[PDB]
Amino acid sequence: MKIGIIGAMEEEVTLLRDKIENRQTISLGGCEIYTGQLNGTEVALLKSGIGKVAAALGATLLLEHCKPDVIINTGSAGGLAPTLKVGDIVVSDEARYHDADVTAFGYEYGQLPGCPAGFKADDKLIAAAEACIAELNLNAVRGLIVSGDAFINGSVGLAKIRHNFPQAIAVEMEATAIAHVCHNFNVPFVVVRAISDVADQQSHLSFDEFLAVAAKQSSLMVESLVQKLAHG
Amino acid sequence: FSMKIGIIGAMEEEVTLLRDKIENRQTISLGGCEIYTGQLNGTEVALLKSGIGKVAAALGATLLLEHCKPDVIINTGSAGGLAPTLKVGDIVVSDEARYHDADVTAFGYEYGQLPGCPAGFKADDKLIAAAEACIAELNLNAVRGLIVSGDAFINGSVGLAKIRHNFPQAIAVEMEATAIAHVCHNFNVPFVVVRAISDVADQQSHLSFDEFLAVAAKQSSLMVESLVQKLAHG
Ligand SMILES: CSC[C@H]1O[C@@H](n2ccc3c(N)ncnc32)[C@H](O)[C@@H]1O
Numbered sequence: 468m469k470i471g472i473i474g475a476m477e478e479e480v481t482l483l484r485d486k487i488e489n490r491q492t493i494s495l496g497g498c499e500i501y502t503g504q505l506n507g508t509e510v511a512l513l514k515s516g517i518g519k520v521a522a523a524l525g526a527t528l529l530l531e532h533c534k535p536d537v538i539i540n541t542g543s544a545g546g547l548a549p550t551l552k553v554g555d556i557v558v559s560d561e562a563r564y565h566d567a568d569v570t571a572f573g574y575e576y577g578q579l580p581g582c583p584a585g586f587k588a589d590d591k592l593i594a595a596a597e598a599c600i601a602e603l604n605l606n607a608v609r610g611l612i613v614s615g616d617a618f619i620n621g622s623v624g625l626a627k628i629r630h631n632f633p634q635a636i637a638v639e640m641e642a643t644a645i646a647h648v649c650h651n652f653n654v655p656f657v658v659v660r661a662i663s664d665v666a667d668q669q670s671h672l673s674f675d676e677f678l679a680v681a682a683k684q685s686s687l688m689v690e691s692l693v694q695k696l697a698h699g
Numbered sequence: 700f701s702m703k704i705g706i707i708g709a710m711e712e713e714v715t716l717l718r719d720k721i722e723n724r725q726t727i728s729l730g731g732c733e734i735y736t737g738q739l740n741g742t743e744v745a746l747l748k749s750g751i752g753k754v755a756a757a758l759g760a761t762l763l764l765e766h767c768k769p770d771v772i773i774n775t776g777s778a779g780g781l782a783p784t785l786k787v788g789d790i791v792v793s794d795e796a797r798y799h800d801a802d803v804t805a806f807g808y809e810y811g812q813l814p815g816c817p818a819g820f821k822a823d824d825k826l827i828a829a830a831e832a833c834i835a836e837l838n839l840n841a842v843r844g845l846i847v848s849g850d851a852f853i854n855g856s857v858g859l860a861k862i863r864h865n866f867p868q869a870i871a872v873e874m875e876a877t878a879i880a881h882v883c884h885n886f887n888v889p890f891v892v893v894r895a896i897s898d899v900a901d902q903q904s905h906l907s908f909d910e911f912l913a914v915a916a917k918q919s920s921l922m923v924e925s926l927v928q929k930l931a932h933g
């Protein structure tokens with residue numbers, strides 16, 4: 468099997484990239500795809516860049532080109548659920564755009580025409596992720612992750628997300644775009660990210676200071692997840 | 700005679716007229732998108748129906764570029780008019796595209812800019828000139844300028860006000876142009892947006908859209924046909 472992995476920033480893909488053996492690099496459409504094996508498992512790691520379009524472009528390339536069996540979106544996120552603290556894990560059971568609005572025509576807030584109002588992550592991928600979380604003794608929350616093309620740091624931006632998606636556990640900028648692409652190609656996906664901040668008026672400083680920590684936690688989780696999917 | 704022109708429209712109504720005119724037409728269904736190949740007035744074209752929104756347009760544009768390698772991309776369809784002299788049916792030609800809903804300002808990026816990208820994506824000068832030549836020849840009313848995109852249908856109120864305040868110079872607003880420009884930019888492919896006005900993005904936009912979408916589609920499609928011809932023969 469081939470496992471696809473997508474991270475947005477250098478920090479979020481560098482540790483995994485350093486571990487890929489029989490590594491080959493593909494530079495294309497402004498993205499980088501690293502192919503090879505992670506602890507014996509065939510993977511394809513994509514550094515997509517930040518934002519929905521960058522992520523959609525990279526996911527599309529990855530699916531069309533390398534044709535992985537499942538997609539795992541790694542990286543950092545702004546924590547919204549009460550029990551989350553920096554470094555904690557968020558596992559998507561679903562992804563929705565918090566900034567899409569075509570309600571003028573009767574679509575659900577966050578829903579784009581031609582798409583489900585939310586994209587569901589794969590149950591097996593979620594089960595495997597949670598088994599790893601238990602085995603590594605990590606604090607994690609499973610639930611709705613919302614994406615938009617904006618960095619959230621309190622004020623109006625956070626307020627609007629709370630209103631439309633009070634049950635969202637985390638917010639970031641690529642997951643739902645990746646889920647949307649996977650949905651169109653019928654590819655299972657799961658988002659496994661780590662908290663770099665709590666999306667408030669202090670998230671800039673928190674993100675700056677804890678991104679490396681969040682990237683590491685999510686990377687270790689992905690490493691464990693890949694191994695679990697490949698060997699049980 | 701060796702040029703392949705890529706054309707991207709989001710909705711059925713926006714691509715149907717051009718599609719019916721493609722000779723030796725074939726249909727490719729990939730990634731939830733539909734691409735029609737063949738010739739338009741003898742010029743090789745690849746017409747994609749992308750679906751609505753930034754991600755749907757990005758996915759489609761990426762497929763079209765990777766799969767059909769067109770030499771240039773023309774984004775067709777409707778838009779909400781923002782510049783004063785625009786009436787329903789008029790043409791808007793992009794000289795630039797920017798996301799009106801992207802905000803990473805907390806980190807010092809320009810409003811609308813995503814990290815790793817230029818704050819705005821510039822349309823091709825030759826494609827712009829050709830489109831304007833077509834405009835002068837069809838004797839249509841048009842405006843050239845900044846087109847801004849977002850994943851929201853602008854219906855007046857705060858959505859509209861925020862846009863006018865952040866991009867006072869924007870001539871129109873829609874939902875796919877900048878995502879297509881972004882993908883084209885990353886692939887180094889020349890692009891131009893030539894859309895037509897279906898509404899003025901105000902509280903009436905919902906009704907105006909339902910009523911004049913066909914008119915915008917007709918006017919934009921005429922422009923695209925003329926542009927394809929212009930680009931291949933002069
Ligand atoms: C530098 S923009 C923030 C990047 O980290 C993720 N991230 C982390 C925290 C966070 C937040 N509070 N709001 C939005 N995106 C966030 C996003 O997916 C994007 O790739």
Ligand SMILES: CSC[C@H]1O[C@@H](n2ccc3c(N)ncnc32)[C@H](O)[C@@H]1O
Pocket residue numbers: 569572709710750751752777778779780851852853854872873874875876897898899900904908
């Ligand atoms: C049914 S969503 C609107 C569709 O038509 C375009 N459009 C036209 C007018 C308009 C507006 N006022 N606001 C946003 N998108 C608009 C968009 O790019 C999208 O494909």
